[PDB]
Amino acid sequence: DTKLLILALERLKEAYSVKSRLNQSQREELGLIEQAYDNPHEALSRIKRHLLTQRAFKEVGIEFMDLYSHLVPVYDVEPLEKITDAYLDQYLWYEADKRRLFPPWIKPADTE
Amino acid sequence: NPRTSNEVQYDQRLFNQSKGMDSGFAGGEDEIYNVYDQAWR
Amino acid sequence: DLIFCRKQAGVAIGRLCEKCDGKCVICDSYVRPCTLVRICDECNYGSYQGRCVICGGPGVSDAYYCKECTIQEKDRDGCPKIVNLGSSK
Amino acid sequence: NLQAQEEEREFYNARRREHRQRNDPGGNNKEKEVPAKEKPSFELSGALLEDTNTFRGVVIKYSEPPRWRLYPFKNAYLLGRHPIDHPSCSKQHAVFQYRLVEYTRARVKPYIIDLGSGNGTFLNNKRIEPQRYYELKEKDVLKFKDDEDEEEEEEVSD
Amino acid sequence: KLINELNEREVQLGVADKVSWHSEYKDSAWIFLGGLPYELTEGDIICVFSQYGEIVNINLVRDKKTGKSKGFCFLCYEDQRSTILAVDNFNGIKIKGRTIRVDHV
Amino acid sequence: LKRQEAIAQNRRLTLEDLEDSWDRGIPRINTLFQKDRHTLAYDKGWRVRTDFKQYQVLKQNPFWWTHQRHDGKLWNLNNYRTDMIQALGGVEGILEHTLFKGTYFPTWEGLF
Amino acid sequence: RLPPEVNRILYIRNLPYKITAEEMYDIFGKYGPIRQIRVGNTPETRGTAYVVYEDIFDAKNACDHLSGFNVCNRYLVVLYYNANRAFQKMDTKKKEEQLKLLKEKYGI
Amino acid sequence: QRRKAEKDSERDELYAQWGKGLAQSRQQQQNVEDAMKEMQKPLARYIDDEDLDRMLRERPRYSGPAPPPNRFNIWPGYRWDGVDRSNGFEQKRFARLASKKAVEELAYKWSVE
Amino acid sequence: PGYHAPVADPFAEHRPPKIADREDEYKKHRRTMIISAEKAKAGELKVVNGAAASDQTPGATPKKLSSWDQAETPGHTPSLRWDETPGRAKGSETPGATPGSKIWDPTPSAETPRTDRGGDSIGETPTPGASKRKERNRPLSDEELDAMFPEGYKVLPPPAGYVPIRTPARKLTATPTPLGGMTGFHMQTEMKSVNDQPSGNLPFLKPDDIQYFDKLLVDVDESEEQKERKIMKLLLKIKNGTPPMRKAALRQITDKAREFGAGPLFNQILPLLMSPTLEDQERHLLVKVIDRILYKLDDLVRPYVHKILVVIEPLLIDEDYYARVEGREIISNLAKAAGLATMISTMRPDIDNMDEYVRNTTARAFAVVASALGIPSLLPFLKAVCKSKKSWQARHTGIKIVQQIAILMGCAILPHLRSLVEIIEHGLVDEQQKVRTISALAIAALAEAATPYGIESFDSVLKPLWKGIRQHRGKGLAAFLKAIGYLIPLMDAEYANYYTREVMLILIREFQSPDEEMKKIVLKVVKQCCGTDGVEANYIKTEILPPFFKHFWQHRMALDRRNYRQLVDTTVELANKVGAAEIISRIVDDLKDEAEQYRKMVMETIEKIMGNLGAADIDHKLEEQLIDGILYAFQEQTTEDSVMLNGFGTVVNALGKRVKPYLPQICGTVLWRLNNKSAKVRQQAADLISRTAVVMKTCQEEKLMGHLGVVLYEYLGEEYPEVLGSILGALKAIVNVIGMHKMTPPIKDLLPRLTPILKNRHEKVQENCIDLVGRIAD
Ligand SMILES: [Zn+2]
Ligand SMILES: [Zn+2]
Ligand SMILES: [Zn+2]
């Protein structure tokens, strides 16, 4: 579990790595992720609690990155649900690879 | 009693050189520079 | 946890560190330094030579009493070297 | 001029060396460098339990061929008298250390090694001399005048 | 016991080699192993400490009359870096339940 | 092969026998020896998460296809700098365009 | 090659109120012989149990494989049980008879 | 008293030459050979013969297993017990020094920004 | 992939950055601690008979008799104290019969606790003996089984048959592991109960702490004592949670002390403070709650005193200092809180305990309690202990107690010094060694706290000691040297002339021992012996200094801490006698030595030396080697520290204007270094200017003031705060030498250039800045 949570948290930290003064919400995100390093078991239990219960989340921001040809959707979530979802993802992919869920023909693959 | 293990596996001098995880290199920001691995002189 | 030792006042001069330097001991104030501090060598000895009366660092100066504590005559009680209610070191 | 000095020296092993380095007592027959369990060697063979190679033991009491149990070798094993020895044997002729069975790598292959038990041990009713690893092949037989039992080996197939 | 904490102040502060306090000597092979177990003998301690070198000759102090070890040995290797390695490495070791001590001489 | 020979010799492999291939191979063999390697062994699907980072994060990643932690660093440009300075006429060549001789520094070897 | 804090006693939780000691002995009986096992019969302690083995390494292999192991719908809480704490409910005594015995039989 | 005082005194030669480091002395000896190279080889470059054979190949000693790496790379003696007895300070000291090398690089990576 | 899988914690990296294990293999035995007038001679035979009846404890008896030296003073107090030592019941019987026979003869002219230690040692002799005849895994009994687990659990057989499976399990752990077995899973579609600590909030539980706090997890509520233990989980709020929860919880439990009583609290605490996973902070906080509740509870704690100390005594021996002063404080509050007889009668059985750990930390405990209740109250106990004829370990303990009393009380020992000595003296001649060693050591500690006074109280101790000085090999010798060492300053320069001159020989001979304990002792000795006013210079100059700088100055010493300091001091004093140019002249060449710590050492040494004696003694050439040494050493700085800087400043200010020819080299180095690579050395070169200001002034080098003035003026745009601060400081010091109207950067320039800097946040800038604005504004 610690392995997974660590990976996901690093991933989240990687978007802000250049780190200008950012903003308020982003500040909340860095402080909360930073919190997750100090007391991991807390974060893991809170996460599993969400996954067992909450069916209603908060509103996601949306904005368009401009490639000058086709626009790219961009979504913004509150940090709590981002850490929760992130761990959910590292875990899902891990179990998935262990159990050989995806046959080889699907190739945005880690190997190559 | 020797202390034995199957096979040999690997030494040590290297077995712990480069950082860990760390992840690539920012989302891919312009500001980063970082093209060169070692200093000039 | 922190209170005076109040052993008998000797002829040894008080020693305050950088931090405590300006403070009159009891009134906690910087005003009107007038008279001089005396504490027993039981409180001031050895590693306490030139030690701070408070924090436990080396004394860079000597404490002076205020005029306030002067008229109220508090400077004449037991040696005002604070002891923590563990040991003094 | 009988004994010049009464003490002199040794240049010899110490009991606490060999003691501390092998303890269940102190034991003999420390595993060689090769030894590895058979199941993981069936994992490098890419073999699930269906096609995997597992050595099962078979017992026949030497007087009556007519299982007290059946024993897997997959989980080396110390064949001894019973507590120290893992593979305990009720045979009263077995020395406190009788023999050992180590799977080694030459391939994952079974091996039997006598510890120099005082009586000896018979292989296919033909004994082997002490202090060398002797490969065993399937269906071979072991018995520990002093033989109260028999043993056979089987690979798992069919 | 004090040794290991000197090696930690030497590594922690970034001493960087030749200023090492094994350069205190440069003249001496013979090492001091104290706090040794009484059952031990020449061939043994030779077999354990030939690990880090080739030991030329060791005189272990054994009481003259009774003819048993007083509990320590002065050893001599063929190589100094073996001594540096041995003091800096083999120290704080358990033997027969008791932790031996080593240091130069 | 280097693993097999090491097995038969029972002696483990050193750095030097691997100094040949050290930087070579698509996995970039040196990446086995990363200190944090454990953690990364439990990371899966990283390559696709990088593909979908464009939606989570506003900025545009050109390096989306690979990641140095799983795949290593796939290029070394250190030469390009040296050859660049050579083509311009050496330190004395480039500096000849500057104020350097104004600063009256004895040498450029100490420019900081 | 073991951490010192682990002990032959394991506290086990997330148990049903119907659970049978048959399943208990069977399952836990993999790793080694049971020294014995207790189960809370009291309003707060119902759902909890303590397992004690003839050897520690038994328990070590246990918590190794039994970590988060499943029964019914539940993933059992498997922890190494502490020491001291509440003890002195019992006393130190009754040493005299047994020590007199070992002093008698073997004579030592 | 000549032969006796030469037993004790020539033992001062023996245990004196032995004391320091018999291993150390030979390495010093090799340097002496090097001086000999200088007399004939004042400024050697390349194909001159010592270099030739030089690049033309690229007393019991302990047998069993392997001896863990020693900063100074010394094979253990003949009859050595064949068991690692250590505080592990070599490895950790060995590992830590290696770690620093990684540190100098990831220190640099910082500089360009 | 399988090859990369063959190539197949960071949280354990960052989490271990929080707190630590900190501890050795010796201390971890903590984890093994489970929770809790000639008819006065013949009359001593009588009392020995009666008390022996009510066997063999020497201590209580000598405690009883210990009231005799006051004779006719003794009174009802003897009933009080002994009341705790034996059963308070028989207490009234024995003390009553004693006063009767005493008053008559004059005219005509816990047991269970100790019973446990005896059985403990006897089982130790049984097991130890058996192996000769021939640990925690030893088989157990059902009463022993009922001993561990708490209340409310049942033992079960399910079958007799499954029990027979458990019995064959041992045989089948070998047998059935060698048999057919495996596990598999099938693909099929699929309730999940669990508990955190819910109520409203209940800050989080670590996965282990569940064992302690499990009772809180169950939600059964609202139906006596069980509700007090249940509500007492406010502990959990103290341990983990937000700081406000810890505060409010802490008060709430303070005011409920008198309510809940000490029993339930300690019952629910001592397990936590005993926890193997305990933090640093959590420990300290539980220490706080123990204090705050022990400011209130007084008579209540009597049953729990030992049950407290067992956990607390490990605080006295610790690497953390604040932990130690806390521990001494709370044991002070406990002993003073409880009664004397409570403490005494409590802590006896730990004296003869097999482990020396508990003996030691127990000794420091008696030190603390003796500081609490005073020396004279506790004297007869001790004086009874050191004469105990049972076994030596006791006397060893009691003597160690004398020592730790010496360290703790220190200067305040003075009144009872005589009685204390009269106690300890009988151990110096004892057949056992330890007792002798630790004894003489305790004399040392005494004399060191005895700084000069009470010499004749040590008097009778001497003549044996000196004799021992001859015949001893090993550590005990060095110990004697420690004692005698601290003694000599207390003797008369005539008697101490002879005696000293005798000590000097052995002192010389013993420089060379590899023992570092040795070198510490003989070092401090050389300080006291050779720092004596009654010693002749030339004798030291010849006999001592060459071996002193030979063996003592080496790279073994300096890397260590205590050896570093003490070495500094001793060398300083030798300079104080033989003079300056000698010492310095010999140690200058080492300024240029490779390693830092060594350079740091000789550097601070030169600093203190030239601080005391003055630079006047120094000749010319050695002064060249000085300034060059100091610059050279200063040019390579691996760490930031004052020693090099204060060193330089003191050297220069001591040299006065003899330094003038050296300035251009100095300040050249000062500017070139004043660039280098920024953040490291800028601040340091700046500070160097700051402290060298006055010297760069009085000698009247004005060009240099132009230099520093405008050059430093230019750096005020430096973005690194830690540098800029040092810059402003340097400017400050330059203002205090050259005056207002002569400032080469006229204030019109300077001050408004300072004004915008006040936004600068980070500290040192604000400090120096505001200071300078103050000097000029004033
Ligand atoms: Zn006082
Ligand atoms: Zn202060
Ligand atoms: Zn005042």
Author numbering:
A (entry chain A): 835 to 946
B (entry chain R): 402 to 442
C (entry chain 6): 7 to 95
D (entry chain X): 171 to 194, 209 to 250, 258 to 266, 280 to 286, 293 to 316, 323 to 360, 382 to 395
E (entry chain Y): 8 to 112
F (entry chain A): 1391 to 1502
G (entry chain 5): 12 to 119
H (entry chain Z): 480 to 537, 563 to 617
Quote the passages of the study that discuss this structure, keeping the authors' original sentences.
Pre-mRNA splicing is executed by a dynamic ribonucleoprotein complex known as the spliceosome. RNP remodeling of the B complex by the RNA-dependent ATPase/helicase Brr2 results in the dissociation of U1 and U4 snRNPs and the recruitment of about 20 protein components, forming the activated spliceosome (Bact complex). Conversion of the Bact complex into the catalytically activated B* complex by the ATPase/helicase Prp2 allows the branching reaction to occur, generating a 5′-exon and an intron lariat-3′-exon intermediate. In this manuscript, we report the cryo-EM structures of the human Bact complex in three distinct compositional and conformational states at resolutions of 4.9, 5.1, and 6.5 Å.
A follow-up 3D classification with a soft mask in the RNF113A region led to the identification of two major conformational states at average resolutions of 5.1 Å and 6.5 Å on the basis of the FSC value 0.143. As will be detailed later, the 5.1-Å and 6.5-Å reconstructions represent the mature and late human Bact complexes, respectively. Compared to the mature Bact complex, the late Bact complex no longer contains the splicing factors RNF113A (Cwc24 in yeast) and NY-CO-10 (Cwc27 in yeast). This structural finding is consistent with the biochemical observation that these two proteins only transiently associate with the spliceosome and are released during the Bact-to-B* transition. Because RNF113A directly protects the 5′-end guanine base of the 5′SS, its release may signal the beginning phase of the Bact-to-B* transition. Therefore, the late Bact complex likely represents the state of the spliceosome just preceding its transition to the B* complex through the action of Prp2. Intriguingly, the N-terminus of RNF113A is buried in the cleft between the endonuclease-like domain and the N-domain of Prp8; therefore the release of RNF113A requires conformational changes in Prp8, which is confirmed in the late Bact complex. With the dissociation of RNF113A and NY-CO-10 in the late Bact complex, the RNaseH-like domain and Bud13 have been dislocated, and the endonuclease-like domain of Prp8 also undergoes a 45° rotation. In the third step, the splicing factors RNF113A and NY-CO-10 are released, leading to the late Bact complex.
